[PDB]
Swiss-Prot record:
It is found in: Cytoplasm; Cytoplasm, Cytoskeleton; Cell membrane; Cell projection, Lamellipodium. The gene is ARAP3. The chain holds residues 1 to 80 of 1544 of the full protein. This is Arf-GAP with Rho-GAP domain, ANK repeat and PH domain-containing protein 3. Phosphatidylinositol 3,4,5-trisphosphate-dependent GTPase-activating protein that modulates actin cytoskeleton remodeling by regulating ARF and RHO family members. Is activated by phosphatidylinositol 3,4,5-trisphosphate (PtdIns(3,4,5)P3) binding. Can be activated by phosphatidylinositol 3,4-bisphosphate (PtdIns(3,4,5)P2) binding, albeit with lower efficiency. Acts on ARF6, RAC1, RHOA and CDC42. Plays a role in the internalization of anthrax toxin. Residues 5-69 form the SAM domain. It comes from the Eukaryota. Tyrosine phosphorylated at a low basal level. PDGF treatment stimulates phosphorylation. Tyrosine phosphorylation is increased in cells that are in the process of becoming attached to a substrate and that start spreading and flattening.
Length: 81
């Protein structure tokens, strides 16, 4: 099974990046599920209650899942010798 279901607790979604704690502000925002938040962007994450940059890009990188489906993977090849 690829990606997560629409009825997926917002805590289980952020828990993938060790940031499930953010599920609080998320739920209070009217989105307690990855399906109710599906669509949020970077600029939108700022008003969502997120101030950490490294964390913000950590969420969106997971939301992109679907058409490409690519999270937690290497991105380098060769170095010199």
């Amino acid at each position: 099974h690829m990606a997560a279901p629409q009825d997926l607790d917002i805590a289980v979604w952020l828990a993938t990046v060790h940031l499930e704690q953010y599920a609080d502000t998320f739920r209070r925002h009217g989105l307690a599920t990855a399906g109710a938040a599906r669509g949020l962007g970077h600029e939108e994450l700022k008003q969502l209650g997120i101030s950490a940059t490294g964390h913000r890009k950590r969420i969106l990188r997971l939301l992109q899942t679907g058409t490409e489906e690519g999270s937690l993977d290497p991105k380098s090849d060769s170095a010199m010798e």
